[PDB]
Amino acid sequence: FTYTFNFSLWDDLFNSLPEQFQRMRKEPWYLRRIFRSWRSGMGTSDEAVAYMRSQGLSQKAIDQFEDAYIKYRAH
Amino acid sequence: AFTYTFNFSLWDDLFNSLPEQFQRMRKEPWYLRRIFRSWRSGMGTSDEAVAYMRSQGLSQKAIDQFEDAYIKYRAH
User: Fold this and answer.
1) Residues in contact with A57: Cβ distance below 8 Å, sequence separation at least 6, in sequence order
2) Domain spans of chain B?
3) Could you identify which of A7, A62, B9, B40 might form a hypothetical disulfide with A11, taking C-beta atoms 3.0 to 4.6 angstroms apart as the criterion?
């Protein structure tokens, strides 16, 4: 499974992802590792969103990571 | 800009899923804000909001969290 994200140059400069999210965006094996753990632990969407907001992710970023996870479950 | 993170469980998301317009408010902060600002302008009452949410099949847990979100929105 691979997901290609959709961040603009503006995003990359001024909304830069925290290191662990950047690593998921850039390294498919890590995206998969994290998604697999998340799926195992039965974590909820609202908990995920609350965490990402606390880490300073944009709503755009949150939407894309939620989308990637949805596509990952199906895959 | 005001944001509220809801607290629904996996059980809620599967078996108590929100109607589309409520799901949208839950997932999209700009839409939560749009609706709350319109609600605030229209001077609708709490019992009217609850009556509507009940008719839409929202759980009491959902109703409580949207009421809470609105209270926090008004303060913010």
Assistant:
1) A17, A18, A21, A65
2) 19-75
3) A7
Whole-number Å distance between alpha carbons of B68 and B76: 12
Q: Quote the radius of gyration of chain A (alpha carbons, Å).
A: 12
Method: X-ray
Looking up tokens 């799901």, which residue turns up?
Answer: B23
> Nearest-CA residue of chain B relative to A60?
B28
How far separated are the first and last CA of chain A, in Å rounded?
A: 7
Residues in A closer than 8 angstroms to B29, CB to CB, are 59
The answer, for B55 touching chain A at a CB cutoff of 8 Å, is: no
Distances (CA, A) of A26 to A5, A7, A31, A43, A48: 9, 12, 8, 23, 20
